Design a protein around this nucleic acid. Structure first.
Ligand code: DCP
Ligand code: CA
Lengths: 353, 956, 352
DNA sequence: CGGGCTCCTCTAGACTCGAC
DNA sequence: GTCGAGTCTAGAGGAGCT
């Protein structure tokens, strides 16, 4: 595949081609991610957190440990659901026993493969009154599917499938239509209160949450996303060789450059602009520090393969009129913008995306 | 009980015919019977037997008056007396001059002699002339109002105008409306003014009725829409002097003709703010008073003429009831709005992604002038406007070095900030991008700016070029005189690249499997694109129309067929068409639907029935929407409402089309209603029968209409559908076009559009056969044209005259089709008026707790009490029976067939959905009504089930 | 004692009252953190990231796995150092083999005690041996400055020099907890040894461009515990008020409602809540409560939760728009317009 | 001669007002 | 003095319902 070569070369992935196969990437046995894959996954996690936790008065963070202590010897966690349930009674003090509410987490879960695979998964455990369980499951199915389709170049590749458990429990399964086939990226389950009662034996008055004026033992719903396979889906979705990652998912937003001279004033201007953009939450690629001078075609190809939204070129002319050369990944059309207005335009472009 | 027509048609049962038409019916003319038998056997219809429907025995209420017509006249008089009295008192009233200074206080203020403003709680009058002014900036709350009584002048001011507050609640309640309380309220377009009275929203109906001068103008001297266009363009031709547009200016100039009525040029209510209205208070109040006075003048000049041309009391007694429409809603309305808007945004964003990707990838054709060989993006503006102006490791830096480098770089950056002065005050918009691309990108000054060509849509004229659409291997092309077409290459008589088009077509014909060589809408050589022929796209309305977009719903069959293809291939074009078809309706109707005025009844205002029902949620909100229906908005006196008479039925693919399903009755109440079965078809059949021989089914058309049933599928609509092969809902359009003057070419086009299998020849042959048929329906046509060509066309049932703009004296044979359709449509309006009068009489007499809800033409919904649903259903069957009998009686038939005597089914549901057995599953409502909102399917009952449930007694 | 009781009650430290212990908090063997503790640690990690990785053009993030496979039968990682060295050779491509450069990570490290995991923030600095000690002193100064920046009493964040068993120089940072100084960070100048060990033979790959010539680079390790740093700052902050720094406090403003009508005033509260969140200000939706406690009780509760400001919406807010604004630090009540609130909060957070 | 309505978006022309 | 952007309007064509 050309995409895997690009991802290795542009430091989205790590290791050799032998170590990076489809199965190793889908299992968690790959050696890791490059400095750009780390930032793309950070962007995915930030967007998931913003969508799910930030704009909800009822969703709270939770801290589930990596190891399952005790029964003879402990193990490594396989899902974040089990650790979230242990916080249910304690987090009823935050919402004052009001229902519904949620607990959300992003962490690494270890799955047997005998090799060991690590997956970064984002999970929400939603405690809802039993009468509203199906409507909340449908709501979260729609919300999650539209979140996945929001950053997609082709939203029709993301799909959904109504499934069912062994115990006859209604659920759902999201997918991404990878070139070889469909792979499970998210799974919503309408578990019920079986796990809450099994984990909290004894009196059930400790587990009572207020469905309006009626106390009730909540039905548990679980959403479990896949951030590693999610960013692999988005890398395949984005892919003249250019990775058209979403402006909110592209690891690096802008790339600065220079002219031939005068180096002393141009580099001071570039350092000032570089600090200006970093103070405003815009990741910059310091291309003005490169010791090799290459044709703009080669530099543009390099920046396109890395998903650089804009290329800023500071020349000696900038010292006179303050104008910089701005290039666009999507259109490849060069425009002139005053260096004073650059930060506002970039923030506008990233936010309005 | 069994009785038969002389032509062997099962007529009304003995126990009903004796109670309605009375005994003593004369024997029919045997010569007429023989003539009708000869006519029936001429077309091979005589001798066909029909099963005897089970006869109905029912003890009807006493029909006082002497006969049916006297009964209806007495009912209408007793209903319309207390409001005709108030209108008469208004006509004979002398009013003191309009006060010079209007009060600024909050509430109602009464101006006594010498304009002495006095605070009064409510106008203590039984007749008012009303007008409400609303500031659109803040919302839908009333701003101020002026009322005219027989004695005094009144003015109203709101808290949101006299009082300043940082925030006012957006959810309207009856506590911020106009308190007006056998009252009559007169106004021009009074439906708008009715919606702002606080007692019009309670479930318990107060006895208030509203008279509309707009409706009376449309009744007296209305004007057709084409005639509206002609009248506006001008502003035989004598009609242009007896008819006017519906503005209060034109209506006042027509009926009164005084000094021209002047409107405010600033428009401080439509395009203003609350401070602009607090500033110009006296001016706005005086304009309001001027309009109230113009309405009073027009009412004085209109009430006599209306009763002159619409003298039957039933017309007014029904127009009064058709203006108290009432839709109850609940919290599901807001959920519907939010879900529909979100789904619309999702699908629109998906389509925008798909198109903006195609736009961005096309700008790369600018490099090297490659667009000149693009058979789609060759004629666009590919112009660029210029920008306008007026070593080893040093080691770790020390702390002072860090600070100095930081501050010196910061100062180097900030010293260039002063060079903004060389930039023009008008910021240039994407000067580095081609011309066709700048237009698609919103300017950075817009408050809704989005990155990329965010303004792209499927209706734009560049989208069929960015998608590289082709029709049968020919690139799509647009001409400013013929709409969309396509460039058939190989003609030898920025330039159009014809060699590129030839290469594209060669690739298509060598890959798809194909082979002066094309036949289509025709080579319109006036376009003259060099090197190729411009063939137009076929439009569904004919070869004279122009296609406004190749993404119209008539191209999806052609898209899936394989003639219309997208350049990218796969499911791009089909998905574009599918999304457009899904979001077509909501795109047009979201501003209407989302801006409906909903007033939320507080728990105090709700009756005990609602609050004590076990289904009454203590957390939910129950409100109501008063439709702003113009009780006579067409030349045919039909009701008009932009939203609720246009509301779409729930389709599986249409977004937001569950609109009527959101009108959910409050707990303890049910929505009882029914639809008239083949209303205008039966009206035309009975008119033809009364004109031909005076017996039901004497004509071939009447016999065909009468014999059959909808359930069996042997009714005329279903029979025609099976004959042609189209669905029944399209057989409606086919037969109604046949009645309303459509030529055979229309039938050919309709068959080719609907039945895709039928070619041109098959559709033409079937149309010729069904229109050739001294015909089956000739007598109906003859009677309708006789009524239309008479000196003063009138409705045969109630006698309401045609509009003065459409009399043959003022029109020399033009607009004849509109006049001939007026007969049947106004007969349907008379049917509706009779139904409303009869239902109101039955409800009043037998103490049924329910009120009129809405009437969408053939349909009639009643918000009946839950316990009175079966009595209301029986009442609805009885009123249908009496309305049909009255229609027959006014035509001199004195008998009614049993088949058309009762409603096929009286729906008892908790929604306004078309059929009871509908879950209303749309893209915006994928789960359904029952899964999401919990609306159980209702029940549709026949006459026999209603009789069994009610024991045949309306009294309980 | 009282601080840990407050933290457990206010959802800084999740778990049972007996389940929390000093040595359990200082070892990683504790049930975990409450949502407030999770957000405090997230704030601390974001501050570390911004002050190490973001502004420095030489520093890149690294992706080290939790387990270490292969014969030494896998093993959980004990430090973030070795995963960084495994990326050394392939991460010379980012800087075109130019020295110096660094690889920084925040992740979990599992220390046997029981398995006690600590989330650590590390930075490996590949520098030519000529300037190793100079960069060590540079990073020592910058790390001490960063730790002292948020401290209410920066005298407690001390530093000391140390000698490794192999004679390698290094420094250690300590926070003066009320019971003694606990090590919160450590800097070491371990040179090349490991890079060579891990990469035996063909030192041409390990060679880095020290200007013109090629050399193998000495590595510097800066490793600091974010969990013990959170403990240090919780003790630094702590009338029972936790005066956390504005940049570290998990929840900034506590939004509230005070009068009737409920539905008119909760729309104002929801609008303000949505406005504040869109601008990155953490709000506590106290207006959702049905049972209203005393205003002084709300003030005490929010002081214990380290919430900077309390905003109260009343009847008057509908008329003229004035809200009640309370400051945690100065316990001062004031009235300000609702439209001015967001800008005020943003400027207040930026100023600190 | 299908009819009667309603409203929407897109495009092109005409006019006005401020800036070079 | 002249030229380009904001605004305003009118016409064309598509799409709901009965
Ligand atoms: N394309 C149409 C649709 C309707 N109508 C008129 C004639 C009808 O009498 C009236 C009501 O329309 P319906 O759809 O109710 O037509 P029917 O009454 O025949 O249908 P049904 O028998 O199912 O009530 O509107 C028309 O002229 N042309
Ligand atoms: Ca009908």
């Amino acid at each position: 595949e050309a995409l895997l070569e690009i991802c290795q070369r542009r430091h989205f992935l790590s290791g050799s081609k032998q170590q990076l196969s489809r199965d190793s990437l889908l299992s968690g046995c790959h050696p890791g991610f490059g400095p750009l894959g780390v930032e793309l996954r950070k962007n995915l996690a930030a967007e998931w957190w913003t969508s799910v936790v930030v704009f909800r008065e009822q969703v709270f963070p939770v801290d589930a440990l990596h190891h399952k202590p005790g029964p003879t010897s402990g193990k490594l966690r396989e899902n974040l659901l089990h650790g979230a349930l242990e916080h249910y009674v304690n987090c009823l003090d935050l919402v004052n026993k009001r229902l519904p509410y949620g607990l959300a987490q992003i962490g690494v879960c270890f799955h047997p493969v005998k090799s060991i695979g690590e997956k970064t998964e984002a999970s929400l455990v939603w405690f809802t009154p039993p009468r509203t369980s199906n409507q909340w499951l449908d709501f979260w199915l729609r919300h999650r599917l539209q979140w996945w389709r929001k950053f997609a170049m082709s939203p029709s590749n993301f799909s959904s499938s109504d499934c069912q458990d062994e115990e006859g429990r209604k659920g759902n399964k999201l997918y991404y239509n990878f070139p070889w086939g469909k792979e499970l990226i998210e799974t919503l389950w309408n578990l019920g209160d079986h796990e809450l009662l099994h984990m909290y034996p004894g009196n059930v008055s400790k587990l009572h949450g207020r469905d309006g004026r009626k106390n009730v033992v909540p039905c548990v719903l679980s959403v479990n996303g896949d951030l590693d396979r999610g960013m692999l889906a988005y890398l395949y979705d984005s892919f003249r060789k250019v990775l058209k990652l979403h402006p909110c998912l592209a690891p690096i937003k802008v790339a600065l450059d220079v002219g031939r001279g005068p180096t002393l004033e141009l580099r001071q201007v570039c350092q000032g602009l570089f600090n200006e953009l970093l103070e405003n939450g815009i990741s910059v690629w310091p291309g003005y520090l490169e010791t090799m001078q290459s044709s703009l075609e080669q530099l543009y190809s390099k920046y396109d393969e890395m998903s650089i939204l804009f290329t800023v070129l500071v020349t000696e002319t900038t010292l006179e009129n303050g104008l910089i050369h701005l290039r666009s990944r999507d259109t490849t059309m060069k425009e002139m913008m005053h260096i004073s207005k650059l930060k506002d335009f970039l923030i506008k472009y990233i936010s309005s995306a | 009980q069994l009785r038969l027509n002389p032509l062997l048609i099962q007529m009304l049962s003995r126990g009903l015919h004796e109670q309605i038409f009375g005994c003593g019916g004369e024997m029919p003319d045997e010569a007429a019977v023989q003539r009708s038998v000869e006519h029936l056997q001429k077309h091979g219809l005589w001798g066909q037997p029909a099963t005897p429907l089970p006869d109905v025995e029912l003890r009807l209420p006493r029909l006082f008056g002497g006969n049916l017509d006297q009964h209806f006249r007495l009912l209408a008089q007793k209903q319309s007396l207390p409001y005709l009295e108030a209108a008469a008192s208004l006509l004979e009233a002398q009013l003191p001059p309009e006060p010079k200074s209007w009060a600024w206080a909050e509430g109602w203020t009464r101006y006594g002699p010498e304009g002495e403003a006095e605070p009064v709680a409510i106008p203590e009058e039984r007749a008012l002339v009303f007008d409400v002014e609303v500031c659109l900036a803040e919302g839908t709350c009333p701003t101020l109002a002026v009322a005219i009584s027989p004695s005094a002048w009144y003015s109203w001011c709101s808290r949101r105008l006299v009082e300043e507050r940082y925030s006012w609640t957006s959810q309207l309640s009856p506590a911020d409306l106009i308190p007006l309380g056998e009252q009559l309220v007169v106004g021009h377009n009074v439906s708008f003014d009715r919606a702002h009275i606080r007692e019009q929203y309670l479930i318990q109906d107060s006895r208030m009725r509203f008279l509309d001068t707009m409706s009376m103008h449309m009744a007296i001297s209305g004007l057709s829409s084409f005639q509206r266009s002609l009248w506006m363009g001008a502003k035989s031709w004598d009609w242009m002097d007896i008819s006017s547009a519906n503005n209060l200016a034109d209506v006042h100039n027509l009926y009164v003709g005084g000094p021209p009525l002047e409107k405010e040029p600033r428009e401080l209510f439509v395009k203003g703010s609350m401070r602009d209205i607090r500033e110009n208070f006296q001016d706005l109040m005086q304009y309001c008073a001027r309009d109230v006075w113009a309405t009073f003048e027009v009412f004085q000049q209109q009430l006599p003429l209306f009763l002159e041309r619409c003298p039957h009391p039933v017309t007014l007694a029904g127009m009064l009831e058709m203006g108290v429409s009432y839709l109850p809603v609940n919290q599901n309305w807001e959920r519907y709005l939010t879900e529909a808007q979100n789904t619309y945004e999702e699908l629109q964003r998906e389509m925008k992604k798909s198109l903006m990707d195609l736009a961005n990838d096309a700008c790369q054709l600018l490099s090297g002038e490659r667009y000149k060989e693009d058979p789609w993006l060759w004629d666009l503006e590919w112009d660029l406007q210029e920008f306008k102006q007026k070593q080893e490791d040093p080691g770790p830096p020390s702390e002072e070095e860090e600070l100095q480098r930081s501050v010196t770089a910061h100062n180097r950056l900030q010293q260039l900030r002063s060079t903004t002065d060389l930039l023009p005050k008008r910021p240039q918009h994407l000067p580095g991008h081609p011309g066709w691309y700048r237009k698609l990108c919103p300017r950075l000054d817009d408050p809704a700016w989005a990155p990329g060509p965010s303004l792209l849509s499927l209706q734009m004229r560049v989208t069929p070029k960015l998608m590289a659409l082709t029709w049968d291997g020919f690139p799509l092309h647009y001409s400013d005189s013929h709409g969309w077409g396509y460039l058939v290459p190989g003609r030898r008589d920025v330039t159009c690249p014809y060699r590129a088009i030839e290469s594209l077509y060669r690739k298509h014909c060598l890959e798809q499997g194909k082979q002066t060589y094309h036949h289509g809408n025709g080579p319109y050589n006036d376009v003259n694109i060099p090197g190729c022929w411009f063939f137009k796209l076929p439009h569904k309305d004919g070869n004279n129309y122009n296609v406004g977009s190749p993404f119209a719903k008539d191209f999806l069959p052609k898209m899936e067929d394989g003639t219309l293809q997208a350049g990218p291939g796969g499911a791009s074009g089909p998905r574009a068409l599918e999304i457009n078809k899904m979001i077509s309706f909501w795109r047009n109707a979201h501003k209407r639907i989302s801006s409906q005025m909903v007033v939320w009844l507080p728990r105090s205002a709700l009756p005990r029935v609602v609050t004590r029902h076990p289904s009454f949620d203590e957390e939910g909100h129950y409100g109501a929407i008063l439709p702003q229906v113009v009780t006579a908005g067409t030349i045919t006196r039909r009701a008009v409402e932009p939203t609720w008479l246009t509301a779409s039925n729930a389709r599986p693919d249409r977004v937001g089309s569950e609109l009527k399903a959101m009108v959910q009755a409050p707990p303890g109440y049910v929505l009882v209603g029914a639809d008239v079965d083949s209303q205008e078809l039966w009206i035309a059949a009975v008119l033809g029968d009364a004109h031909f021989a005076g017996m039901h089914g004497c004509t071939a058309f009447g016999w065909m209409t009468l014999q059959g049933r909808k359930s069996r599928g042997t009714d005329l609509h279903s029979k025609t559908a099976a004959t042609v092969g189209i669905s029944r809902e399209h057989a409606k359009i086919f037969n109604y076009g046949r009645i309303y003057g459509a030529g055979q070419s229309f039938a050919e086009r309709l068959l080719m559009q609907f039945n895709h299998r039928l070619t041109r020849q098959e559709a033409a042959e079937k149309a010729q056969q069904m229109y050739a048929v001294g015909g089956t329906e000739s007598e109906m046509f003859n009677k309708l044209e006789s009524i239309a060509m008479s000196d003063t066309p009138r409705t045969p049932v109630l006698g309401c005259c045609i509009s003065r703009a459409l009399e043959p004296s003022v029109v020399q044979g033009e607009f004849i089709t509109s006049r001939v359709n007026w007969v049947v449509q106004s007969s349907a309006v008379d049917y509706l008026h009779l139904m409303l009068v009869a239902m109101k009489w039955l409800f009043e007499e037998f103490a049924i707790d329910g009120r009129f809800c809405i009437s969408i033409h053939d349909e009639v919904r009643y918000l009946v009490r839950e316990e009175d649903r079966y009595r209301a259903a029986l009442a609805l069957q009885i009123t249908n029976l009496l309305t049909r009998c009255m229609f027959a009686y006014k035509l001199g038939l004195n008998d009614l067939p049993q088949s058309v005597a009762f409603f096929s089914a009286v729906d008892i549901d908790q929604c306004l959905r078309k059929e009871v057995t509908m879950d209303c599953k749309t893209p915006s409502n994928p789960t359904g009504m029952e899964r999401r909102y919990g609306i159980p399917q209702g029940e549709a009952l026949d006459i026999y089930q209603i009789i069994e449930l009610t024991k045949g007694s309306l009294e309980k």
